Design a protein around this ligand. Sequence first.
Ligand SMILES: Nc1ncnc2c1ncn2[C@@H]1O[C@H](CSCC[C@H](N)C(=O)O)[C@@H](O)[C@H]1O
Ligand SMILES: Nc1ncnc2c1ncn2[C@@H]1O[C@H](CSCC[C@H](N)C(=O)O)[C@@H](O)[C@H]1O
Ligand SMILES: Nc1nc2ccccc2[nH]1
Ligand SMILES: Nc1nc2ccccc2[nH]1
Lengths: 257, 268
Amino acid sequence: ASAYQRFEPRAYLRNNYAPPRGDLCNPNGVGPWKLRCLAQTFATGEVSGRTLIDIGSGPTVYQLLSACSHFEDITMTDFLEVNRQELGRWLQEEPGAFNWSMYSQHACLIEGKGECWQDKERQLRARVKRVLPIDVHQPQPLGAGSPAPLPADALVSAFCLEAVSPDLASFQRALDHITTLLRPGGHLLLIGALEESWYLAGEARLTVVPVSEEEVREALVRSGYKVRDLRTYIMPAHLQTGVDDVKGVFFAWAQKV
Amino acid sequence: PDSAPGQAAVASAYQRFEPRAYLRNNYAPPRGDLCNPNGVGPWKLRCLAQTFATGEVSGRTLIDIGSGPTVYQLLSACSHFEDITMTDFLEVNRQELGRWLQEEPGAFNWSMYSQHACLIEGKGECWQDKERQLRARVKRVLPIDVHQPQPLGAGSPAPLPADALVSAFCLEAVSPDLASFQRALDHITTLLRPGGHLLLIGALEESWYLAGEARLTVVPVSEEEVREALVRSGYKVRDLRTYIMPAHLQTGVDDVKGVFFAWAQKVG
Ligand SMILES: Nc1ncnc2c1ncn2[C@@H]1O[C@H](CSCC[C@H](N)C(=O)O)[C@@H](O)[C@H]1O
Ligand SMILES: Nc1ncnc2c1ncn2[C@@H]1O[C@H](CSCC[C@H](N)C(=O)O)[C@@H](O)[C@H]1O
Ligand SMILES: Nc1nc2ccccc2[nH]1
Ligand SMILES: Nc1nc2ccccc2[nH]1
């Protein structure tokens, strides 16, 4: 884990959410695919409630753009203080915040409600109530007496579990840990890297457990979920850049039973 | 009656027209705020998008009459016409358009309008691609005077006759009275092929507006006067809608009471 102490948010953001990966004009790219998975899932109207927790948010907000209109109380989390600060800069509109507006605009485009991207960002900022430390390796990831309303009605988590677990067994336990935060009958939207073993974040070099779609499906089942949806995006050559060795991205919609 | 004097008054007044002040007055918040679906900006873009979505308005060439320094009126049009001519009476406006065509930082930022057009067109198009296509399809920017029998002049570069005309907030803003407005419509109608389409946007019951130091005179027209002018010029009126300006959009930049949108097809 000590590897994460060198994690640089700006390098991470540049590596994954600036062009080419962060170019949203091409409908066949990874960004549009991710936003589409999230928007379509929420458009079913089956993922609803009052409170939601985003697990391992890092310095990003794209994962909550479609979610925020369905949950009035949102908790964002990360293991690193520098990531929580980076989030704070965007949430508070402070100087030097990352520019997420391309993602916000595309979410509005995809959702098709004629919403301006400014209203969308306003709603997300308003509904994110708190940003908390978290460690998915702990039986109680949020600790003993957290300000977060528990259990949550829904969880979101993108590119975290596989990125912090040495092997499949560790991946499984981490999922078990965060699953305790979710109310029975609640929903988990999980996004992650397929068959990845490393990625870079400035001076940090992070180890990743390479997982397959079937392995993800089986882990969700073992954690007591019914898998409602599980899709794969295969990474095209033009998005394989040397910041990592990712082969694909998965999206899972799972419901706790 | 004699038209020269009134037209000289107009030409003189426009020598003080300031494009930047005009842009700010009309295409920046609150009027340029596109978030409220009940606002005038979204209404205009909607009228244009819905008209082009019928598929009924297409062809090869289009002429925008009295573009001024604005491009919003062509955002939905540009996907249907490979050759677009923009025009204005004033060099300073043509220069403004030039800055935007060159994608210069000093140019007015139309991205809020571009994004909204992509939003309502519903094709998942990114605004950068929309702006790139408009820039590619603008083939020329020319002087124009709608008061001349040949508004573009003799032997113009523009492909004539055009398959379609667009014109926003021009005719009523440059005509001393209704008689002049009618003649101006007659003049630009010579530029359009029989069976071609005109999309006309304009101010209802307006008598003045500001563009910096310049306070410009406008002929107050009603919806029925607009409809009759179109019939008189030889159009079938396919659509004529009215937007009533809410009080919070009456900002002291003008005395406009409403905005009209007309879709008309030249008989022939
Ligand atoms: N033990 C732990 N428990 C929970 N999160 C951790 C963790 N160790 C590292 N992390 C966080 O896991 C994140 C992986 S990067 C993914 C960030 C963001 N959700 C995205 O979609 O881009 C980093 O922000 C890292 O700080
Ligand atoms: N005699 C004339 N013939 C054609 N256009 C004229 C004219 N006299 C002034 N104009 C132009 O009429 C425009 C009115 S302002 C409207 C500009 C733009 N089409 C819009 O939608 O915001 C100005 O650009 C002005 O320069
Ligand atoms: N952490 C992370 N974010 C990504 C976005 C697109 C493709 C691969 C990615 N890995
Ligand atoms: N020239 C001009 N542009 C306008 C935009 C909205 C309402 C009135 C307007 N008059």
